[PDB]
Amino acid sequence: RNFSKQASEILNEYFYSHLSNPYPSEEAKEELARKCGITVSQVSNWFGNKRIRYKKNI
Amino acid sequence: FYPWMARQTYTRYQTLELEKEFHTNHYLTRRRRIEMAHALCLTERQIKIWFQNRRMKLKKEIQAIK
DNA sequence: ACGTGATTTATGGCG
DNA sequence: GTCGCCATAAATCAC
């Protein structure tokens, strides 16, 4: 259910390195899905959850 | 910092009726939109938006198979 | 119980 | 000037 240490590290590295625009494109989501060993919907869910939880935690 | 950094749940009954109409017809007629809205105490926009969300949920259901 | 991944309401942009 | 799809926000659900 919960993503591996590496998958979360990959997603967070992307998010914070792209903090100016943390909205990966379709292909960038696919690249992140292949690297993390998750689905594109799971990448979309992760980014959606990360964007809201980051802005509230300010 | 950046420009990007800047809802009511439905009752089990409302969801039951909305689901019933979708299971009968995936698309909502103008007349049904007014009949559903009055009977469920939801706006005409709310019923339309629900049908659109439910079609989009059905999309992800068929794609989930393969 | 908690937290995180998933789902439910709601919006606007676009074709 | 109508509609519906898609990505997304924010709240909420739930394994």
Resolution of the structure, angstroms = 2.4
Which pair of structure tokens corresponds to residue B4? Answer: 């990007």
User: Which amino acid is present at B43?
Assistant: T
Query: Are A24 and A47 spatial neighbours (Cβ–Cβ below 8 Å)?
Result: yes
3-state DSSP helix/strand/coil % of chain A, to nearest 5: 70, 0, 30
Show the CA angle centred on residue B48, arms to residues B65 and B33, nearest 5°. Answer: 120
Considering only CB atoms, which chain B residues are within 8 Å of A21? 2, 4
Query: Are A35 and A10 spatial neighbours (Cβ–Cβ below 8 Å)?
Result: yes
Domain extent, residue B21, equals: 1-66
CA distance A39 to A20: 24
Residue with tokens 């509230």: A56
Task: Tally the domains of chain B.
Answer: 1
CA distance A54 to A16: 10
Which pair of structure tokens corresponds to residue A20? Answer: 């100016």
- Cα distance between the two ends of chain A: 28
Find the Å distance, CA of residue B52 to C1' of nucleotide D4.
8
Cβ–Cβ gap B2/A58 under 8 Å: no
CA distance B55 to B9: 18
Find the Å distance, CA of residue A24 to C1' of nucleotide C13.
18
Show the CA angle centred on residue A27, arms to residues A24 and A30, nearest 5°. Answer: 90
Domains present along chain A, CATH in parentheses: 1-58 (1.10.10.60)
Experimental method: X-ray
Using alpha carbons, select from B57, B64, B65 the residue that is nearest to residue B15.
Answer: B57
Domain CATH for B22: 1.10.10.60
Using alpha carbons, select from A37, A41, A48, A46 the residue that is nearest to residue A7.
Answer: A37
